[PDB]
Amino acid sequence: PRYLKGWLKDVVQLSLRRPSFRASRQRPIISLNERILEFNKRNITAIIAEYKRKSPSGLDVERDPIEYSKFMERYAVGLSILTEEKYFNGSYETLRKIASSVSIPILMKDFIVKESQIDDAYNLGADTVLLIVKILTERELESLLEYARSYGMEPLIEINDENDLDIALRIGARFIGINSRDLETLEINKENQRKLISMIPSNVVKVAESGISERNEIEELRKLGVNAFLIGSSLMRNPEKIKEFIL
């Protein structure tokens, strides 16, 4: 990983020592990025609904993971499940129950710094994985990117600044997530996110991440060329909003 400080340094250490999970995979891979493109042509807003119990920024809600997912399944383009244990209260067991219950694409959200985590995602039933440019060096990113493709997955590469985008573009990323929240300081900056969305090649599927709570926000981001939206907090607090985001 890269030189890190604070909580990013801690969570990355927890991940280096994360035990692998052994299990048989039932269903074949369902591509999340190809499905976002088909929602685009059908002119249906593509929302990736996220399940997370806790968050360092203050979220804290109790809600059944299976019911929430079966519900989101009627409208969402895919699901994003947190598997990080200490800060998000996630677990590999939750991803597993979810994958056996629905049949739409699943993104595994964690801090992936080593190949065994991708084996974990595959064996658990996830369809793709998230790779964060700011915590990895260029070589590590390039290696983790190839490893995931060897399983037929196109991972979601997350950027937060221009330096991250230079790197993602160089290694040939085709599915990018622009995150408005800075992992290190927890600050949200919608402006910096808009500048970045505008610098991205039009042939890569773009996903806007963090701080979205209103439908006007989604409408604005869409005309800006964004293909999909990853929404966690607002949907966890009020599952019902999915109906408003979708009209």
- The residues near 173 (Cβ < 8 Å, ≥ 6 apart) are 145, 157, 204
- The residues near 68 (Cβ < 8 Å, ≥ 6 apart) are 51, 236, 239
Does the annotation count 243 as an active-site position?
no
10 vs 146, which CB is nearer to ligand 137? 10
159 vs 183, which CB is nearer to ligand 137? 183
The binding track of 109-148 with respect to ligand 137, each residue x by CB under 6 A or -, is ----------------------------------------
Contact residue for ligand 137 among 102, 231, 242, 245 (CB under 6 A): 231
2 vs 181, which CB is nearer to ligand 137? 181
If DSSP codes are grouped into helix, strand and coil, which group holds residue 214? Answer: coil
- The residues near 81 (Cβ < 8 Å, ≥ 6 apart) are 50, 51, 65, 90, 94, 95, 98, 106, 107, 108, 109, 126
Cα–Cα distance, 215 to 207 (Å, whole number): 16
Question: Does residue 201 interact with ligand 137 by CB under 6 A?
Answer: no
Burial class (CB in 10 A: 0-12, 13-18, 19+), 52: buried
The binding track of 42-81 with respect to ligand 137, each residue x by CB under 6 A or -, is --------x----xxx-x----------------------
- Interface with ligand 137 (CB under 6 A), residue total 16
102 vs 208, which CB is nearer to ligand 137? 208
74 phi/psi in degrees, rounded to 5: -70, -20
Does the annotation count 210 as an active-site position?
yes
Residue 79 CB neighbours (<10 A): 27
Question: Does residue 183 interact with ligand 137 by CB under 6 A?
Answer: yes
1 vs 211, which CB is nearer to ligand 137? 211
The Cα-based distances of 191 to 161, 206, 207 in angstroms read 11, 16, 16
Set 15, 180, 209, 227: catalytic member: 209
Contact positions vs ligand 137 (CB under 6 A): 50, 55-57, 59, 179, 181, 183, 186, 209-211, 230-233
The residues carrying an active-site annotation are 50, 52, 109, 158, 179, 209-210
